[PDB]
Design a protein around this ligand. Sequence first.
Ligand SMILES: [Mg+2]
Ligand SMILES: [Mg+2]
Ligand SMILES: [Mg+2]
Ligand SMILES: [Mg+2]
Ligand SMILES: [Mg+2]
Ligand SMILES: [Mg+2]
Ligand SMILES: [Mg+2]
Ligand SMILES: [Mg+2]
Ligand SMILES: [Mg+2]
Ligand SMILES: [Mg+2]
Ligand SMILES: [Mg+2]
Ligand SMILES: [Mg+2]
Ligand SMILES: [Mg+2]
Ligand SMILES: [Mg+2]
Ligand SMILES: [Mg+2]
Ligand SMILES: [Mg+2]
Ligand SMILES: [Mg+2]
Ligand SMILES: [Mg+2]
Ligand SMILES: [Mg+2]
Ligand SMILES: [Mg+2]
Ligand SMILES: [Mg+2]
Ligand SMILES: [Mg+2]
Ligand SMILES: [Mg+2]
Ligand SMILES: [Mg+2]
Ligand SMILES: [Mg+2]
Ligand SMILES: [Mg+2]
Ligand SMILES: [Mg+2]
Ligand SMILES: [Mg+2]
Ligand SMILES: [Mg+2]
Ligand SMILES: [Mg+2]
Ligand SMILES: [Mg+2]
Ligand SMILES: [Mg+2]
Ligand SMILES: [Mg+2]
Ligand SMILES: [Mg+2]
Ligand SMILES: [Mg+2]
Ligand SMILES: [Mg+2]
Ligand SMILES: [Mg+2]
Ligand SMILES: [Mg+2]
Ligand SMILES: [Mg+2]
Ligand SMILES: [Mg+2]
Ligand SMILES: [Mg+2]
Ligand SMILES: [Mg+2]
Ligand SMILES: [Mg+2]
Ligand SMILES: [Mg+2]
Ligand SMILES: [Mg+2]
Ligand SMILES: [Mg+2]
Ligand SMILES: [Mg+2]
Ligand SMILES: [Mg+2]
Ligand SMILES: [Mg+2]
Ligand SMILES: [Mg+2]
Ligand SMILES: [Mg+2]
Ligand SMILES: [Mg+2]
Ligand SMILES: [Mg+2]
Ligand SMILES: [Mg+2]
Ligand SMILES: [Mg+2]
Ligand SMILES: [Mg+2]
Ligand SMILES: [Mg+2]
Ligand SMILES: [Mg+2]
Ligand SMILES: [Mg+2]
Ligand SMILES: [Mg+2]
Ligand SMILES: [Mg+2]
Ligand SMILES: [Mg+2]
Ligand SMILES: [Mg+2]
Ligand SMILES: [Mg+2]
Ligand SMILES: [Mg+2]
Ligand SMILES: [Mg+2]
Lengths: 176, 48, 224, 77, 100
Amino acid sequence: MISVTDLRPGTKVKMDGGLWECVEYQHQKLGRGGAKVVAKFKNLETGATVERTFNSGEKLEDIYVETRELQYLYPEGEEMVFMDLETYEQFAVPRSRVVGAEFFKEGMTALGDMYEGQPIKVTPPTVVELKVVDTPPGGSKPATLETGAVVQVPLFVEPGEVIKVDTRTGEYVGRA
Amino acid sequence: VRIKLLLECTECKRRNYATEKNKRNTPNKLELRKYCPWCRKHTVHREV
Amino acid sequence: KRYRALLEKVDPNKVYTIDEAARLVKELATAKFDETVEVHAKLGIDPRRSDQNVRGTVSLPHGLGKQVRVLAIAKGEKIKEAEEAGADYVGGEEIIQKILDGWMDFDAVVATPDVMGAVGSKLGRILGPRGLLPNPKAGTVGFNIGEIIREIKAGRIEFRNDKTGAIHAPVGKASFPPEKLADNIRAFIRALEAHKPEGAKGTFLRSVYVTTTMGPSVRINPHS
Amino acid sequence: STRNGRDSQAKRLGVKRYEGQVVRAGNILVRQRGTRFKPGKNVGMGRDFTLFALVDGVVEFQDRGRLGRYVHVRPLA
Amino acid sequence: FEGGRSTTLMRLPKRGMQGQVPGEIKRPRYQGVNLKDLARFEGEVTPELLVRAGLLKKGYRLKILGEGEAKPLKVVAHAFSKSALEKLKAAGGEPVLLEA
RNA sequence: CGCGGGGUGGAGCAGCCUGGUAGCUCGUCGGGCUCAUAACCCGAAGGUCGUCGGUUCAAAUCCGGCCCCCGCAACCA
RNA sequence: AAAUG
RNA sequence: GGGGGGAACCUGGGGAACUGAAACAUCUCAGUACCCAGAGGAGAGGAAAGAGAAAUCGACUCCCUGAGUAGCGGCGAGCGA
RNA sequence: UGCCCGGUGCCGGAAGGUCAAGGGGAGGGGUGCAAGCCCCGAACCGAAGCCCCGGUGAACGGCGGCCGUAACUAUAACGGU
RNA sequence: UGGUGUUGGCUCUUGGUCGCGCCUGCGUAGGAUAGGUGGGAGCAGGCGCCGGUGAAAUACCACCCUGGCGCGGCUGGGGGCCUAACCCUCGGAUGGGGGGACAGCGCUUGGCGGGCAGUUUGACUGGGGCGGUCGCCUCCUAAAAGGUAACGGAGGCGCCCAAAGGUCCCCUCAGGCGGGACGGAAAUCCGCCGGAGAGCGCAAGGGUAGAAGGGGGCCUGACUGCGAGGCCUGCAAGCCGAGCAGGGGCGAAAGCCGGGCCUAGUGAACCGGUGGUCCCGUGUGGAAGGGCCAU
Ligand SMILES: [Mg+2]
Ligand SMILES: [Mg+2]
Ligand SMILES: [Mg+2]
Ligand SMILES: [Mg+2]
Ligand SMILES: [Mg+2]
Ligand SMILES: [Mg+2]
Ligand SMILES: [Mg+2]
Ligand SMILES: [Mg+2]
Ligand SMILES: [Mg+2]
Ligand SMILES: [Mg+2]
Ligand SMILES: [Mg+2]
Ligand SMILES: [Mg+2]
Ligand SMILES: [Mg+2]
Ligand SMILES: [Mg+2]
Ligand SMILES: [Mg+2]
Ligand SMILES: [Mg+2]
Ligand SMILES: [Mg+2]
Ligand SMILES: [Mg+2]
Ligand SMILES: [Mg+2]
Ligand SMILES: [Mg+2]
Ligand SMILES: [Mg+2]
Ligand SMILES: [Mg+2]
Ligand SMILES: [Mg+2]
Ligand SMILES: [Mg+2]
Ligand SMILES: [Mg+2]
Ligand SMILES: [Mg+2]
Ligand SMILES: [Mg+2]
Ligand SMILES: [Mg+2]
Ligand SMILES: [Mg+2]
Ligand SMILES: [Mg+2]
Ligand SMILES: [Mg+2]
Ligand SMILES: [Mg+2]
Ligand SMILES: [Mg+2]
Ligand SMILES: [Mg+2]
Ligand SMILES: [Mg+2]
Ligand SMILES: [Mg+2]
Ligand SMILES: [Mg+2]
Ligand SMILES: [Mg+2]
Ligand SMILES: [Mg+2]
Ligand SMILES: [Mg+2]
Ligand SMILES: [Mg+2]
Ligand SMILES: [Mg+2]
Ligand SMILES: [Mg+2]
Ligand SMILES: [Mg+2]
Ligand SMILES: [Mg+2]
Ligand SMILES: [Mg+2]
Ligand SMILES: [Mg+2]
Ligand SMILES: [Mg+2]
Ligand SMILES: [Mg+2]
Ligand SMILES: [Mg+2]
Ligand SMILES: [Mg+2]
Ligand SMILES: [Mg+2]
Ligand SMILES: [Mg+2]
Ligand SMILES: [Mg+2]
Ligand SMILES: [Mg+2]
Ligand SMILES: [Mg+2]
Ligand SMILES: [Mg+2]
Ligand SMILES: [Mg+2]
Ligand SMILES: [Mg+2]
Ligand SMILES: [Mg+2]
Ligand SMILES: [Mg+2]
Ligand SMILES: [Mg+2]
Ligand SMILES: [Mg+2]
Ligand SMILES: [Mg+2]
Ligand SMILES: [Mg+2]
Ligand SMILES: [Mg+2]
């Protein structure tokens, strides 16, 4: 239970039962009243934000949502499994909490928000390598990547050709 | 600590304890040693 | 048929007391080979609750032997400790090539953290859904590889809940000395009981039995 | 608005029985951190380097050049 | 009280066991009385000749015991200490059991 | 005078708690498409990580002093 | 579908 | 027959807070103050579906003890058979 | 009388998620010589409320930052992030 | 807002729950419809193994699921129609209308609830507020015993080691100048020179190579009953501790060991929880609940 006067962007805390992270913090003490802490937050899983204000007293409740680096191993059910390339533990993350679970790859290294040994956000890198196993040798054509997902690519990019794809736009960002 | 953790020792089927501190992760995954019980004298001793 | 005169050896209504199903579990199994005594138990949890899955091993007082081929994939003289431990197969990122391409003649697979990286990176999907991959919880990763390898021979077996919410695990051989298996059972229960997911509402072990590799499964009181 | 203002509760160290003083077995003769003084005749020292009498007697402070300093206890003869 | 500190209510109640609710278990209590003082009177001391004397009194159940020398005289009591039982074995009374 | 955050390729932002990894978009130069220019396609170069110290086996990262930076306050008289 | 000199 | 009055005392129906806890809320103050109904020279209570450990006592009330005990208690303040 | 429904409010959602008495009794325990008597007690069924999906601005309210760029300069209609 | 009371007729219809038993689970590919998962080399015919298949393999047994019907008991959800409680009404009625077992109201449940109530909203402080600070360790200030202030100067901690602990035996550093294949400027090697500048997990200090440092073999005294005698001290705590007993570890033995080179790594009581113990156990026995030891 940390108060507010002691916040800093980056500090993660539990508010309204949810997980946030102060991203804006500004001590406010005008007039002779008591001081006030006016911050802005971001949910750890959803992007939702919310600026709020607190008095000098009011305590918050710090959380421990450290971000280790996990690793994909294999699919299973409507879930996919990773591993902390550190302590090699096994995490069965439900497809929802794996941002861009598709456009991923059974063996790629991504990032997760460990909150009590259970990722609530699993992001890959902005762009990853993937072997297109589809597309007609026919310009801006659709191409099924090895991970089953499909992407728009140019011509020259043909079956077997490994390319790059921004995991945020699933757009062809060049070849391997 | 967490990776640390508290723990005691049981005389093997019975009572008494020592209560030391294992250390998770590092040399862990169970652990027993020889130590003297309030009753009778010296035996093994498991965690729990 | 043949199990009929074999199934009468079970009181479908009764509740045994381990021991009760011990003298019995031997009269239950009869085959042209030593049957391994299996154990099953419907634990009260939800698979879908990522947290509550149960992954843990246990070193048994009796039963379990080198009836397993363990592979130690490591770097350094770890190999020396491993090989001296009883590491049927030894060799780091060169043996990954064996397994990666065809090879597959073992059961367990221990490894060292230092070379562990490459393992799951290039072996994930293969032995991954096979449960063979090294996992801390299921203690098959690390550096004290010695005891580790040396132990998968004495009596330490894993047991991870399935998706239906049940867990099974061989507690020993059928021609086992009476009070050994019966004792070897409590060892298995006391460890699985000792692993209750903090938020598991209701009663845990809901249905626990004592079967034989081939046939009859006498349900018992897991507090006997 | 500073970054200091701290310290630790003094510990009161040093010789606590000087040469020629009569003690009883038990009296801690010296409190010190390192081994500024070393055990001597009938003078065991403790975990924290605390020299203490081992027998009823007097205290003597033998200075041994580069060999350090000693505190013995010649029992009452 | 005071300072606003913690009195010295920091020290704990090892006095474990000091109160259930129906109350106190009604059980028989024993009164000392060292033979050292029956020596006062010479006849047949009975727990009453005692109360009335100036020792024991209504406390009920008497347990002659302790220090002092015994005396040639019958001592009716509800109990005796191993030691006085002895000092009286030097010739006297031992009307234990007692009570109807 | 304090209050918090910020100085990373040419520009604008990641990376910093969880020390071993420079991530992105535009720009730049090379080459194609055009008569040519854009666009577009192919490929490449570029970061003392503000500086000066310290800690570490090692630091963009941890630690301190400075330098600029942005925003907040300065009330009762 | 597709800007300009 | 009833109705209204009566200084206190009485029973019953309701029922506070300041206080104390060196804040405060449980607790306390206290079923007190007070309000209302009734009773009468008194009122209540009163002949065991009681007590409680004694082969026990024997309606009820009232004084003294038991007793600041047994207990109760943010086991605090303090309340208290 | 512009734009923003992510946050709060109100409105609308016969499914889901958590849901209290109560129902239910696997099974357990204390006693009894026994009938019994008495206690715990899991699966599962249990509203509204909250979560969750949508709506909503004359509902509480909110309405960006740093660079570059034009025939001298300036400035920036323009572009970058 | 659920459950019940007041609360009643008559029907219509659907589930859900477990107990058991029988089914059931259909993309490539595999002489084929692969629910998982643990067993598994066996269970005139066959089956699997083995080979091929795929993410997974195949029998036979398990457990248990998805969804399905079957009886056994157990619980619910609504749809209507009614009239006589209850409600509203009607040129004034033991009656007629309307609503209707709903609502209203009684006990109980969960929730919303500044409409209202009681209160709380820390101290230090070159005025207060804002800032900063609040316990513990190290150094200075601190004036050569101890102690000693300031919103004086400067740093640390809330841990950590199953070896970084016992014991027994061994070994001696950092640097510097040569000298040497890959080799920085210190990777490893050799020669001198080098008393400590190295190291001792972490701050600083004292300490220390006649080890507190490094290495190895056995071990766990990171003992239980105790604790003379002291340090420090307002209380409470904190710290040292020889020796005895039990029972051990190491050593030939002398001996050494009741954690860690030492000073931080912390939290009174209360209230509860877990073992243990048999101490009390409201007439008796026994339970309920306590107590003591341990955590
Ligand atoms: Mg100060
Ligand atoms: Mg000071
Ligand atoms: Mg001081
Ligand atoms: Mg000091
Ligand atoms: Mg206080
Ligand atoms: Mg170009
Ligand atoms: Mg009254
Ligand atoms: Mg009254
Ligand atoms: Mg009050
Ligand atoms: Mg008060
Ligand atoms: Mg009268
Ligand atoms: Mg009278
Ligand atoms: Mg009367
Ligand atoms: Mg009272
Ligand atoms: Mg717009
Ligand atoms: Mg809005
Ligand atoms: Mg809204
Ligand atoms: Mg629902
Ligand atoms: Mg439902
Ligand atoms: Mg119930
Ligand atoms: Mg219930
Ligand atoms: Mg019985
Ligand atoms: Mg609801
Ligand atoms: Mg408007
Ligand atoms: Mg807003
Ligand atoms: Mg210009
Ligand atoms: Mg110009
Ligand atoms: Mg110009
Ligand atoms: Mg613009
Ligand atoms: Mg009708
Ligand atoms: Mg009518
Ligand atoms: Mg009607
Ligand atoms: Mg009607
Ligand atoms: Mg109703
Ligand atoms: Mg309510
Ligand atoms: Mg409120
Ligand atoms: Mg108010
Ligand atoms: Mg008021
Ligand atoms: Mg008040
Ligand atoms: Mg003040
Ligand atoms: Mg001021
Ligand atoms: Mg302040
Ligand atoms: Mg402050
Ligand atoms: Mg203090
Ligand atoms: Mg000094
Ligand atoms: Mg001094
Ligand atoms: Mg050298
Ligand atoms: Mg050289
Ligand atoms: Mg080199
Ligand atoms: Mg060299
Ligand atoms: Mg050197
Ligand atoms: Mg050693
Ligand atoms: Mg002592
Ligand atoms: Mg003493
Ligand atoms: Mg004291
Ligand atoms: Mg230490
Ligand atoms: Mg040591
Ligand atoms: Mg208290
Ligand atoms: Mg307690
Ligand atoms: Mg208990
Ligand atoms: Mg008893
Ligand atoms: Mg009684
Ligand atoms: Mg009773
Ligand atoms: Mg009794
Ligand atoms: Mg009995
Ligand atoms: Mg007990």
